[PDB]
Every structure is written in C-alpha cells, then in structure tokens.
Amino acid sequence: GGPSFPEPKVVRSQGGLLSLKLSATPTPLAIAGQRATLLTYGGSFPGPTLRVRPRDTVRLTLENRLPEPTNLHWHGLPISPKVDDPFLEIPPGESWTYEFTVPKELAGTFWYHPHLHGRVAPQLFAGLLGALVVESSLDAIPELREAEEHLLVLKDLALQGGRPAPHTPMDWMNGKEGDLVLVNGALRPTLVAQKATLRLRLLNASNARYYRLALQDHPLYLIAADGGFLEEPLEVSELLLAPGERAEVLVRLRKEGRFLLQALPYDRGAMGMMDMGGMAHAMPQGPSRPETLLYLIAPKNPKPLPLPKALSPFPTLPAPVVTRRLVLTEDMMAARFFINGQVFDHRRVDLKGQAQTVEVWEVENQGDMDHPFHLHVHPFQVLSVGGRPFPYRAWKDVVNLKAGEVARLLVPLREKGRTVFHCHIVEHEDRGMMGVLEVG
C-alpha cells in the first residue's frame, strides 16, 4: 500500500528455518521499457531477498536450470567452506542443497551469486544475484525501528538482441560495465519517502562499476559496513562502494523536495582503446560519467529521528601470529591478473594458516587500476591503507585498493577448510586474480 518502489521479494525464516528451493533459469523479463531474457534466481532480477535472524537454519536448494554448470557463493557469510564451497560444480539439471546456521553475533547485508571459476563474470552479468539480510536486536532501538527501510541493489546491465551483451576483449581487461545503471532492476525509480529518516541497505552487485554515492543536499550517516555494524554512526558527504561491497546508511530528510541519489564521477583506472585523439588524454578511460540512480521525494513536514548514539562495540582482536604479503599485478594487454606473480590454480594451495589464530595480511596493489580484494569465509578488520588509519571499525570482506595502495588487514581465521581470495572485479578473477587459502 501507498507508493510503490521496486524491491526484490523477501523470503523470511519462520520458526528458525528458511527452507527454499531456488532455480537458476533463463527468464524473459520486462526491464527498462523492453523485454530481455536474463539468467535469474527465482524468476526475478535481482533474485529474492532472504531475511534471517542469528542462529536460524538456512536450507537453500539450488536447482540448476542453466545450460552450464554453476554454484553459489554466500558472500560475506562466516560459515564453513565445506558449505560455501568455491570448488563445487552443479551440472546443468542437477540440484544442490546448502545447509548452514547463521552465526550468533552476525548482522548486516550479505549476498549470493555464482562462483564457478571461469564463468563468474558472464553469469553474474546476466542477472544471477540476490541479497541476504541478517536482522539484529539493534534493529529494535527506536532510532532504527522507526526508520523507513529499503534495500538498494546497485547493478548495471547492457543488452544486445534481447539478452545480456556478450563479453568483449576489452571487458576481460577492464571488467564489464553496462549502459543501463539500475536500482533493484529498475531504471531511475522514484522513492516517495513516508518517513523522514530512511535506513538504506546498499549492495554493489555490479561486475566492475564503482558507485561514488552522493545524495543531493544531504549527508549519509554510515551505520554498517560489509559484515556488520559500525561502533557509532559516521557522517559522510559521499560513499564509494566498490564491486561486492555493502553498506547501510541513515538518511535524515530535513526539507521537502525531490533529491537525486547520484553515482558521481570516479576514475578506477580503466584503460581505453587507442588510435589517437586531438587533445592529450585518451589512453585511460578517465572518470565515469555521472549517473542518476534514483529520485528521492521527502515526506510533508519532515522531522527526522535523532541518530543512535551507539551501535555495536567491535571486539578486541588478539595479537596476530603471522604476517602475509599478497601483491596484485596485471598484464593489461593479455588481460591476465596475478597474485604474487601467479594465476589461480585450483590444485595449488597458496597460503596455509591455523584455525583460531589472527594473521595480518598486507595486500599491495602494484597495478594501475583499482582492485577490490575479497576473502571468503573469514571477515577481516581493515587496519590501514597507504599507511593511514581506516575511518571506522567494522567487519569487512571486500577492501578497495587504488593503484599503489597497500592495505593492512587483521584476519581472524575461523572455520577449517580450503577457501579462496580474489579480486571482485569478477572478470579479473576469471582471468587469474585468485588464490587458495587452507586453514587447519
């Protein structure tokens, strides 16, 4: 009731159990005024939002109705890599049931998408993605309970002949960006706010596009990062979300009006094609053009809630026992991507660590583009980037590295097993930039 806003259908746990059969299938859909056949979970783009509480059991049966093998990555979930298995392959026409328990202290916005090496980027770009929300007791404090809540899945697209556009040679180098910059599968929707305080869960599910988010005339109050709450709200004028990252922000609408949520120009180091121009700057692509993501209409006589004065304290982490160095490098013309000089080999274990210890990881981008580093299974705390302190304390699972930047991460190793780490420009992952961590 009231004004409608496009948002994925929500499937909720009941009595402590979320049991759901989800088919991955080609799906004709309406999109941006046309019809296209996408690859979808549950017949929708984005896929359905799964909403659970801590200690819930999830029993998701993935039914592969695609022409190719696939699997699922439960991005950001600290569960067993025997469940979240990057090496599993579900052949066409077969099913696989993922069963896990939500950890007791987890909260925030997570997501699921394909992770079959070599085919991640076409499958993700074709529409296979959805959100997972873990509710928290903190959602009951009045300063968040009475906020108007929405999920915003940021995902661009390009169509050719009624289907996802094919990957080009330039796409394997740069990562593929599309011309349709969508929110919850819609082109520039309008959100008619009914409350003056909004709580927006933000998910960058794009293959490679960055979103330098800014709301006209308003700051954002960051309350959650990828994997959990901040310790207290952090006011920002703008918020960069790299591929795979999530955030939750509060918006405090002071005045009536219509305000644009935009993705401001950002230069992630993508390389352009040659032949020569008239001026000076034409090898690098340069900054993205600004994009309007949605229109936000404030309610009448808006009086926003006060901000919560605290959120969730971040646990002391023990002293680290090992330091690791992971150097990212690129060969742009061959479109091959390396960690410590090697490309991914699923038969090769690159790092061996101990369960129940903390390590420091130093991840160094010795390339010229931004690379957003993701580690499965083990959330981390970003200490510093470029030798300077990270602006907040919260669990992250993707950290963006600009050219030459070195991130120092505190990585508590939880579950035993073999998992991966990789760039979340998924084309780069497909083309080399992935390694294997084994915890014992």
Binding residues: 73, 75, 113, 115, 281, 371, 374, 376, 422-424, 428
Q: How far is the CB of 111 from Cu ion (least distance, A)?
A: 7
User: Residues 6 or more apart from 15 whose CB is under 8 A from it?
Assistant: none
Secondary structure class of 248 (helix, strand, coil): strand
- Residues within the interface to Cu ion (CB under 5 A): 75, 244, 371, 423, 425, 428
Q: How far is the CB of 433 from Cu ion (least distance, A)?
A: 5
Q: How far is the CB of 89 from Cu ion (least distance, A)?
A: 18
Give binding residues for Cu(2+) as ranges.
Answer: 73, 75, 113, 115, 281, 371, 374, 376, 422-424, 428
Pair type for strands 357-365 and 322-331 = parallel
Question: Toward Cu ion, which CB reaches closer, 77 or 423?
Answer: 423
The Cα 81–Cα 10 span in angstroms is 26
From 99, 207, 85, select the one nearest 157 (Cα to Cα). Answer: 207
Question: Toward Cu ion, which CB reaches closer, 251 or 425?
Answer: 425
Q: How far is the CB of 172 from Cu ion (least distance, A)?
A: 11
Residue 21 forms beta bridges with which residues? 61
From 400, 88, 391, 63, select the one nearest 244 (Cα to Cα). Answer: 400
Provide the CB-side half-sphere exposure for 229 (13 A, CA): 23
From 333, 334, 341, select the one nearest 433 (Cα to Cα). Answer: 341
Question: Toward Cu ion, which CB reaches closer, 19 or 340?
Answer: 340
Question: Toward Cu ion, which CB reaches closer, 244 or 308?
Answer: 244
Is residue 91 a contact partner of residue 64, using CB atoms and an 8 Å limit?
A: yes
The secondary structure of residue 192, as a DSSP letter, is E
Sheet of strand 95-101, all strands in order from the earlier edge strand to the far edge: 34-41, 17-31, 57-64, 95-101
Is residue 434 a contact partner of residue 344, using CB atoms and an 8 Å limit?
A: yes
Q: How far is the CB of 337 from Cu ion (least distance, A)?
A: 6
Provide the CB-side half-sphere exposure for 142 (13 A, CA): 3
Question: Toward Cu ion, which CB reaches closer, 233 or 379?
Answer: 379
Question: Toward Cu ion, which CB reaches closer, 133 or 294?
Answer: 133
Q: How far is the CB of 372 from Cu ion (least distance, A)?
A: 7
